[PDB]
Amino acid sequence: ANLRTQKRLAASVLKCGKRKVWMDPNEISEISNANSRQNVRKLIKDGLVIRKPNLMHSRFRIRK
């Protein structure tokens, strides 16, 4: 369905950016039903929504 509010809440509870919020593609029904932040934290614990890790500035070649 539509998951704008779910993504916004997911970023709010994960304390990260909504670009880094990863929302499972083949559990859309359950994610859509999860509407409040308590349900969103439930999805976080079950692993349906995962916070993507950060990227890197590669100091490796910066040192090189």
Added chain:
Amino acid sequence: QVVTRDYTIHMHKRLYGVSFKKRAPRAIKEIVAFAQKHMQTKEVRVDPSLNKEVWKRGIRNVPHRLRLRLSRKRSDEDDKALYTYVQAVDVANPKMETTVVE
């Protein structure tokens, strides 16, 4: 009716001179048209893996020849309607001849 074949497409000749900002989108359009004219179908679905393979080098660079696996699978909405599913094949040297996959 339901068949699967490994084709090779000469992408070098299907986008000779095309604009650099349209290479990847026209590549997808040529792939689906290639599948249509081979399997004699209408609905053709592009595997996201093959889309990744097309856009690996950027929107302006596409490999000259690509190995494709065209499967004329039966549709899941109408048992009399049939579609083609195109997925990329990872081969060492793309210059091989067309074959039939079991």
Added chain:
Amino acid sequence: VRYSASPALETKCAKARGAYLRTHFKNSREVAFTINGMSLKKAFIFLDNVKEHKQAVPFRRFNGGVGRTAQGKEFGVTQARWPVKSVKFFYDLLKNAEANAEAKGLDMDKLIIKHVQVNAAPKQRRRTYVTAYLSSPSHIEIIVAEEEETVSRVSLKQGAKARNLAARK
């Protein structure tokens, strides 16, 4: 409601109407003029083909700036187009007309489009930054019906000669 034509009688006809449609009146007229007189099944094939860009609607009257094409050679003209919105509306009314015909109890095989017409609708005002971008909606109605296909005197001289000729015969 009364239509533009004497038919729509219960003997052979079926009715369909669409009012205040967001479709261009000029394109709607072209589609109506093209499909007029066609068989119902032939019209469905034609409209499907226009949707799929295999045949085209000739633009007879409102042909200013319309490009030329090969697909118009089946109607003896060069300016043809593929107005998809008008085709969608006409297809819906034709489907409704067929459904009304089935409800009335007519023979679906002999049904042809006897009377199709497009009329202008009250224009809709929208602003342009000043001037207007007036819309031109269309009133379209369709009538489909199954196809179905001397007391001179004689003067005294004239008849007397005719009687004399008969006597000679």
Added chain:
RNA sequence: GUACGUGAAAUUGCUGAAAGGGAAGCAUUGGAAAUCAG
């Protein structure tokens, strides 16, 4: 049938009739078709 009394003109669509080689309109006479009348 609320976009609702009556519902004109400009303008538009359909049908029928007719005309059309760089104008169209109008007038006079008459034919042709249609129509009415004594």
Added chain:
RNA sequence: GUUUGGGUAUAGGGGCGAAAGACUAAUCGAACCAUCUAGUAGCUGGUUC
């Protein structure tokens, strides 16, 4: 390779201006608004069977 926010003051042949005869709410042949005003017409254009 002084600028500027807010507060306040200056009001119409006035104010303001390093002065362009410039700005003063997209208007400065002379701000805008309403009355006198239905202003003044040797003039122009229309004036109906």
Added chain:
RNA sequence: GCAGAUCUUGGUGGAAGUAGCAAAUAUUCAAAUGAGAACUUUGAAGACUGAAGUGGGGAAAGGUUCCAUGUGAACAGCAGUU
């Protein structure tokens, strides 16, 4: 008693489906919803703003535009399930 007054008010035309549509590089594949998907949502891929941001906040100003649910009559020079 109107044919005019660059007349007043209202309505309607030909031009004409014509001129034209916006700057701001760029979108593609699959799936879901849905009557309907180039434009909605998710994933994957490719890009951009590149800390003097297409970032996060405020003052003036606006005033409910905020959030949820539903709709797709009218508005979003295409479309729309937004």
Added chain:
RNA sequence: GGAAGUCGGCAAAAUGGGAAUCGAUUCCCACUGUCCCUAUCUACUAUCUAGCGAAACCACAGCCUGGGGAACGGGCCAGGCAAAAUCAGCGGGG
């Protein structure tokens, strides 16, 4: 080849610079599609398509030659002529 173009090195290339006269001018050197003399390449527009969709202007219109005392004009006179519907250009005629 090197300003031969143009009122003239306008604009680019030399990286702009050397000497004289009063920043300007001149001179010599230098550079180059300004030119001989144009050719080629790319993007956008224009083209077609789906959707949306105007305005100015509008007595009516739309071929030319000679004449119509003028103002010759498109209507009038005498001629050449004259065949549907259209598309993309260029702008002569308003």
Added chain:
RNA sequence: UGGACCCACUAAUAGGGAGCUGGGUUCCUACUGAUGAAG
């Protein structure tokens, strides 16, 4: 004809009719291409 009346070339550099810039005063129709129904 090429260059700043001038000096060259040239066989010759003859005379006239019916888009642009400098110093000087203080829609339709035409033209060109492209289709196109029809005895």
Added chain:
RNA sequence: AUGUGGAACGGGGUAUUGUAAGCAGCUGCUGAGAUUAAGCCUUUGUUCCCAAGAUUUG
């Protein structure tokens, strides 16, 4: 519309560049490697597809 039929690839020739990665020991493989019709030529190569749909015609 079953044919010296067409198409997609493949080989060869012809061209462009310049001797690849790797294996190695500048040298050898290596005038190699990459590209080659997108408006190049050829094909006893393989695979695939066509004896179909619509419209107008005395």
Added chain:
RNA sequence: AAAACUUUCAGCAACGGAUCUCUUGGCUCUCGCAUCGAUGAAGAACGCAGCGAAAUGCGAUACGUAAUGUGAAUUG
């Protein structure tokens, strides 16, 4: 030399809102009367109904209370 196109005519359908009829309105004339406010006026604001946004009425006693008259409603 048929269609299409353009134009003219007629029927129908559109567009538009003219005409005809109406009218709890306006305009004009005549007659009668003299009555605002610090005991808070005119005006403005904000509220008040079971379901009301505007109009009207009213003011926390709020689409009103008291008193008098009518006599059986209000109305979606």
